[PDB]
Write an enzyme that holds these catalytic residues in place. Sequence first.
Site, PDB file in Angstrom:
ATOM      1  CG  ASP A  37      -7.203  38.228 -64.016  1.00  0.00           C
ATOM      2  OD1 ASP A  37      -6.537  39.260 -63.779  1.00  0.00           O
ATOM      3  OD2 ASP A  37      -8.373  38.276 -64.447  1.00  0.00           O
ATOM      4  CG  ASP A 233      -5.128  43.434 -63.185  1.00  0.00           C
ATOM      5  OD1 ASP A 233      -5.183  42.187 -63.227  1.00  0.00           O
ATOM      6  OD2 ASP A 233      -5.777  44.173 -63.959  1.00  0.00           O
TER       7      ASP A 233
HETATM    8  C1  LIG Z   1      -3.040  38.810 -70.645  1.00  0.00           C
HETATM    9  N1  LIG Z   1      -3.893  39.988 -70.873  1.00  0.00           N
HETATM   10  C2  LIG Z   1      -3.130  41.097 -71.483  1.00  0.00           C
HETATM   11  C3  LIG Z   1      -5.089  39.660 -71.513  1.00  0.00           C
HETATM   12  N2  LIG Z   1      -5.249  39.855 -72.828  1.00  0.00           N
HETATM   13  C4  LIG Z   1      -6.379  39.556 -73.488  1.00  0.00           C
HETATM   14  N3  LIG Z   1      -6.415  39.808 -74.859  1.00  0.00           N
HETATM   15  C5  LIG Z   1      -6.210  41.227 -75.207  1.00  0.00           C
HETATM   16  C6  LIG Z   1      -6.489  41.278 -76.734  1.00  0.00           C
HETATM   17  C7  LIG Z   1      -7.527  40.141 -76.966  1.00  0.00           C
HETATM   18  C8  LIG Z   1      -7.619  39.404 -75.610  1.00  0.00           C
HETATM   19  N4  LIG Z   1      -7.418  39.026 -72.859  1.00  0.00           N
HETATM   20  C9  LIG Z   1      -7.379  38.785 -71.532  1.00  0.00           C
HETATM   21  C10 LIG Z   1      -8.485  38.240 -70.858  1.00  0.00           C
HETATM   22  C11 LIG Z   1      -8.425  38.019 -69.507  1.00  0.00           C
HETATM   23  C12 LIG Z   1      -7.276  38.325 -68.777  1.00  0.00           C
HETATM   24  C13 LIG Z   1      -6.177  38.847 -69.398  1.00  0.00           C
HETATM   25  C14 LIG Z   1      -6.195  39.101 -70.789  1.00  0.00           C
END
Ligand SMILES: CN(C)c1nc(N2CCCC2)nc2ccccc12
Length: 390
Positions: A37, A233
């Site tokens: 990230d 990002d």
């Molecule tokens: C990967 N991305 C889209 C992320 N999705 C979700 N989800 C989205 C719906 C529930 C959690 N949580 C994250 C937490 C930290 C970093 C990226 C993400």
Amino acid sequence: TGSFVEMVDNLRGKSGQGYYVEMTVGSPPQTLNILVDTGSSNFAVGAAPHPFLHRYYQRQLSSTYRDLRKGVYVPYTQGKWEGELGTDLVSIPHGPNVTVRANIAAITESDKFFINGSNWEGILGLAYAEIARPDDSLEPFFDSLVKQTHVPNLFSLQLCGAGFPLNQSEVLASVGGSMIIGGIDHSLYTGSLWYTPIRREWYYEVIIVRVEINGQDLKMDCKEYNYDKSIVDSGTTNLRLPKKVFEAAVKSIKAASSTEKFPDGFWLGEQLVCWQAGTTPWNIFPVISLYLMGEVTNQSFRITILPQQYLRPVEDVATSQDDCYKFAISQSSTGTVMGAVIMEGFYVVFDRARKRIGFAVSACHVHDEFRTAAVEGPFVTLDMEDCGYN
Ligand SMILES: CN(C)c1nc(N2CCCC2)nc2ccccc12
Ligand SMILES: [Cl-]
């Protein structure tokens, strides 16, 4: 540049669920799949049971564990994670072959943070210390890796979207790309690298100066492209754009793809669109071009993405033949966010040592015979620093 042969093909995952790298924590080593990230700065790992976690970090089983005896509360967009801070020895198996002592946040409670069936158990925040929690005195993972070893202060990311939807199991088989730590791998791109300066060391902030749809300028005050801030990002799925910019682009993309018509929901990212197996009319969808500030005075350069990038593959299994896609561009109150969608077209170099981000055409980007993502320049743009919102 050179060859970093162990670090190639070390990522797995997808734009919808994020891309992760295998890491180990503790002595003896505990294996964990960790999301990469670039939009945050904490190394935080699941450290207790959760329905969505198949495994987690067990501090009690690690001889090199040390408790920092401080808690940390990170609110996410919707929901949160809560952590107990500490340190432990950390490795990356398909990595730079050096072990380092790092700050780890043992996640104990969390809400709407982990994804169900994602197959990653933590988050590797690669951004700068200014946005780390609880504050900047918590040294991020990458700061620590550089200070402790001889590794250059730089990493690079090749995110490789497949052309099609991936199951839970198929994500483990299918290669998702490369994180190169301490260098730039020459075989992961073609043509030249073009660098944009990093505006501020917090998020990986950049300045966008111009936008085109099939060569047609959007023709806005370039402050509107960076309205608040523009960032790169890896932890965001879509290309997110400010309101005025988002609407003007949608109108322009609709008009170019007028051979067919699509419901209002498709353009708001909710409804799928579906064609017969292989007959996706890519040629009717326009390319999107972002011009970034170059590091020479009055020079910009252009990254160009295809509908292969901005239309994410997503299955339905209602007539399983069809290739279906969700529209992967959406609104933001953040300013511009160049998520996985964009990054999947390019090899991105995060040159922290020289305060800049490089772009080149990815060797793995998805395309048809007649089109391809591009990185091109220079272009004489004037008054590019007036595109910054300040
Ligand atoms: C990967 N991305 C889209 C992320 N999705 C979700 N989800 C989205 C719906 C529930 C959690 N949580 C994250 C937490 C930290 C970093 C990226 C993400
Ligand atoms: Cl998103």
